[PDB]
């Protein structure tokens, strides 16, 4: 029944991992779009150093 906090913490950790695993590319695209639209140097990111 998870008497100890050391027993309650890893359940939270597994829950966080489970929640993080599927929803990774949607937030990927959201962050990419925001950085593309607002960062003054973000439109060329991915190839900033090239030559």
């Amino acid at each position: 029944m998870a008497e100890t906090l050391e027993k309650k913490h890893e359940r939270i950790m597994l829950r966080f991992d489970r929640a993080y695993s599927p929803q990774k590319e949607v937030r990927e695209k959201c962050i990419e779009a925001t950085r593309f639209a607002r960062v003054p140097g973000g439109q060329w990111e991915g190839a900033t150093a090239a030559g």
Binding site: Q43, W44, A47, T48, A49
Partner: protein
């Protein structure tokens, strides 16, 4: 290549007229020499040509313009 060029430059001592086959062989050897030696330069940027904001200068690159010199 060296031998053919020397022969062409020296035949006049003995007063002989080179033949077209020798001329062609000398040309081929010289062309092989010279295509081995060939180097081509690259036209570098002018110097007042600006570099865009994509390069993220002042953080990733110090200068906002191409140096374009030695």
């Amino acid at each position: 290549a060296v031998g053919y060029q020397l022969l062409l430059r020296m035949l006049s001592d003995y007063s002989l007229e080179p033949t077209p086959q020798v001329l062609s062989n000398a040309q081929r050897s010289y062309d092989a020499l010279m295509t081995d030696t060939l180097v081509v330069p690259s036209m570098r940027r002018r110097g007042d040509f600006p570099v865009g904001q994509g390069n993220k200068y002042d953080v990733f690159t110090s200068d906002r313009y191409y140096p374009g010199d030695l």
